[PDB]
Amino acid sequence: ANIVLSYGEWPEYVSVNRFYTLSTKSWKTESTGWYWKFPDVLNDTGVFGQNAQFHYLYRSGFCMHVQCNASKFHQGALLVAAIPEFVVAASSGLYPDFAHTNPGKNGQEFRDPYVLDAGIPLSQALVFPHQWINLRTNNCATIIMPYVNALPFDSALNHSNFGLVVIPISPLKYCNGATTEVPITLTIAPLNSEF
Amino acid sequence: GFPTELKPGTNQFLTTDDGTSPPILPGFEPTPLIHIPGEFTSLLDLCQIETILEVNNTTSTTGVSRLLIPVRAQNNVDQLCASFQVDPGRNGPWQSTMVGQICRYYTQWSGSLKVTFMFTGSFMATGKMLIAYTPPGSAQPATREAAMLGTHIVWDFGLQSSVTLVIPWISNTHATGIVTIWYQTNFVVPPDTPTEANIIALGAAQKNFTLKLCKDTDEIQ
Amino acid sequence: GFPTELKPGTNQFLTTDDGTSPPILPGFEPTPLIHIPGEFTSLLDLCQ
Amino acid sequence: VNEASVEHFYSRAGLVGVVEVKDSGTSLDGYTVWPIDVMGFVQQRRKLELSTYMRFDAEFTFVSNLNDSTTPGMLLQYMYVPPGAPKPDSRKSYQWQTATNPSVFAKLSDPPPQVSVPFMSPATAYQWFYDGYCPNNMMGHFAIRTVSESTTGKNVHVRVYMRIKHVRAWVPRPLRSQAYMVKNYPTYSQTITNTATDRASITTTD
Amino acid sequence: VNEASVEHFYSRAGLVGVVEVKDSGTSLDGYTVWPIDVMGFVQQRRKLELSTYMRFDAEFTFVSNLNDSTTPGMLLQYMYVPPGAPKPDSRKSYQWQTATNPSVFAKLSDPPPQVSVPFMSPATAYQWFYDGYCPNNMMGHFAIRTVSESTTGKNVHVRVYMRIKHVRAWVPRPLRSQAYMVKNYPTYSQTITNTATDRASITTTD
Amino acid sequence: VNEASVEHFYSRAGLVGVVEVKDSGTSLDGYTVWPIDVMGFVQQRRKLELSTYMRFDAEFTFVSNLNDSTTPGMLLQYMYVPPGAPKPDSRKSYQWQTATNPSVFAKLSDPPPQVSVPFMSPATAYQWFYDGYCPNNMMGHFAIRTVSESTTGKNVHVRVYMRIKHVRAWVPRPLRSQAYMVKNYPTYSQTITNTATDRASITTTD
């Protein structure tokens, strides 16, 4: 399909290289968005969680796919973005708690989508390797992501390389009789991993 | 050689100057460089990325709702829907895009632009629309029968999902164009389907674009 | 040549600098060198 | 064009801070320290945060003067301490004489001193945003002393200018629309302000 | 010959204006601005209006002195602002520290400062006469400040000299016989004066 | 690497001693002598005693100042006497005018004087330890005089910096763990101190 390769370069260096299907999220008329830190989303699941928590050093690339499941009588549009070094700020104790900074595999719901919860206009969050989802055109999106870092071979339990963000620009709406929540599904597949 | 005489300009410090200074830590060696994937060298190529434009800048609208254009069905066939100017550097709709925030660090610019529209409605919705551009130094059209004469493009969102237009050439400094959206045909809908939709503006620049003078910006934080 | 203008950094003394200084005893000659057996040149090889 | 370059975008000198050593009145001391930074002003913050990773060199210039634009011939000392080293704590402490803290000597009536400093970092680039878990990118300090035995009674005002060379930026990010509140942290106020000016209607113009 | 050239006709230095910054008496301020011009004197006007279109570069020299030909060692600052930019409005305003307004620092007892400025115009040449529908050919300004905290009480007198290089003139026109009245406009008086001296008769001579 | 070298280990400038010539109060004299050394400070002693035989050259710099960081224009004289020669003994003795004691003249308000001295030794290298049977390695002296007829009443403070070039070290030896007590002799105190910090047990750690 219409796969996008971030920055045009692949990472380029059985049991721990397989598809991991995450929890499904429900989309409603009122909704802000969700995000996931990506060096940790899998730090509690499968073999990958075990060898990441044991070994000191880590490096890897990733491939992500987002799927929708709606009908021809629904309407909406989403945006999927990947942000290297996504730091989350706190509005006015100058210290966000652990939950927002390091959410589990289920992610955290956005509080203020307009400023991207970091004072970022969100009208410019397209320089990042993004993609669009329109409920009348298609229902899929794929993204490749190499291993960006300043110092090679960093930690996996004390660092966050990047984050993935999904935001509804246009609001969901429908007519009477239709299901009141389209589901969304996310999958991951580690590629060229090292320890 | 030895017979030298000094000349005016001696012992002055000029901020906009480059020369030679001795190192303070001779023999030190820095960390070797490696290959970080992304790299931007030219500042001008950041204006080619298409960002979203804010045309709903009207009081009593806040949040993320200031980014969409509402289109209805009960509206008549011949009337205006929306309009905005072209000036990137000036205040207004072009303040929420990377072209109109990087043109505040310079004074003179010239070239062509690019605007892309996108429709987000139900699959079984059909209709037509009209988009026009009035050249610089004229009057805004009052009827669609007058906007039909100049430069325009028809759009049927029931058969296409996105359309694009290109401005020929603009050049401002420090009266500059206008674009309008008109209705042509109403909005048709089958039973048990919503009667609302939205549009996105998606402004951007072109390959012929130059900046000619450096100055500090004014929109502080 | 003759048309020269001085630049910032003049008349300063930097400790971590090397340059040229005139000799104070011109014409003097030192004792010739001979071969003392042991010789360490690199400081890093004392850790082995 | 050449003017629309990363090389020319960051290639200028400019003030980064003012330092005054006071030896009169209620305060009678001869030394003053200053932690070197690159993001002490808002405008340079918004221009340096268009990227995430950077690597460059720095050149520093010192202009010093009395309180009435007069330039007598008293001597002064400028010393730079690398990161991970004790800093002076008195007018005539022991640290003022060490062979590894590069120091320079100049008079008050002379062309301004000018020095250069290499790229000091244990990584391959500087980071303004760090998602992992008093400037963050430590570079050093500058201790300024007037060489004298007893007090002098005259205050000195010092400004400093920095030029950066051989810039390299890698990944971009959008600019900032919210007001700055705290240093080293992106915390923002609770009254979100719209990025664009307002208009009476979507079908009106001037 | 070489002496009867356009190149040698305009190639000389000369005064263009005098500026005094006053910090004593009823006026206690530290700054003064001056709009740069090329036609502030009558003689240079009549020599620059032999043509209509011109293109050149400029070099500026500054000589500064007290009121009794004395040269102490107080510091001074010269700043140039390009067209289309705010100008300072106070002794210690914010505009005195900007990285894009090229400024220079020099002392009062030193060889005179000397700087050069390129050809600044949005057209292909300057125009002294414009038939279409506060100098007309805007080029910039010069703000001069004495770096001090409080007042000084001493006035400063400054002169400025300009040299022009690489001249190019295109279309000529006759000279001026009427007296100048207003700047930027060719308005002339109502008493027309004859261009030639008078004579008793057409058949007489000395 | 280049940084872990004998060449870079010893290649730095640094203070070796301070000298003050006093001509006020109970002491009214114009001259002061200083026996040049290389091991007047503890840190340089422990760094120069990692070897036994060495050979190098030396460069000396002089910084001089009043007691209030002021630099008037009085004249001064610096003279170096080679080993095996009488030294001055009065403000205006005969030894101040000899053609074989290299002397230099400089003012108090000028860039610091800088001179170089060759490798002065009757052997092929210097020895810090001599098993056979007032520095040991005699090199010379420095006499400093203010050229004047009568007294002046103003004291002068002088510091001196030394750089060494073309180093050569031959045989190494371990460092020092005991406190220094006397110069030119390795005598140590009677309370032997352990080289390593203490621990509660051989099976405990933090």
Residue numbers in the entry:
A (entry chain B): 98 to 110, 127 to 205, 214 to 316
B (entry chain C): 1 to 174, 188 to 234
C (entry chain C): 1 to 48
D (entry chain A), E (entry chain A), F (entry chain A): 70 to 202, 219 to 291
Task: List passages from the publication reporting this PDB structure.
An example of such a platform is the baculovirus expression vector system (BEVS), requiring only the expression the P1 polyprotein and 3CD protein to produce enterovirus VLPs.
The structure of the CVA6 VLP revealed typical surface features associated with enteroviruses, such as the prominent star-shaped plateau (mesa) at the 5-fold-symmetry axes, a narrow canyon-like depression surrounding the mesa, and an open channel situated at the 2-fold axes. The second indication hereof, also deduced from the cryo-EM structure, was the absence of the characteristic VP0 cleavage into VP2 and VP4. With a sequence coverage of >80%, our MS data unequivocally revealed the presence of this concatenated VP0 protein and indicated extremely low concentrations of VP4 and VP2. While previous enterovirus VLP reconstructions did not detect the presence of RNA (center is masked out in the CVA6 structure), we consider the presence of RNA to be the most plausible explanation for this observed increased density, whereby this RNA could change conformation or orientation within the VLP particle. The observed differences in critical force and critical indentation indicate that CVA6 VLPs can withstand less force and deformation prior to structural failure than their virion counterparts.
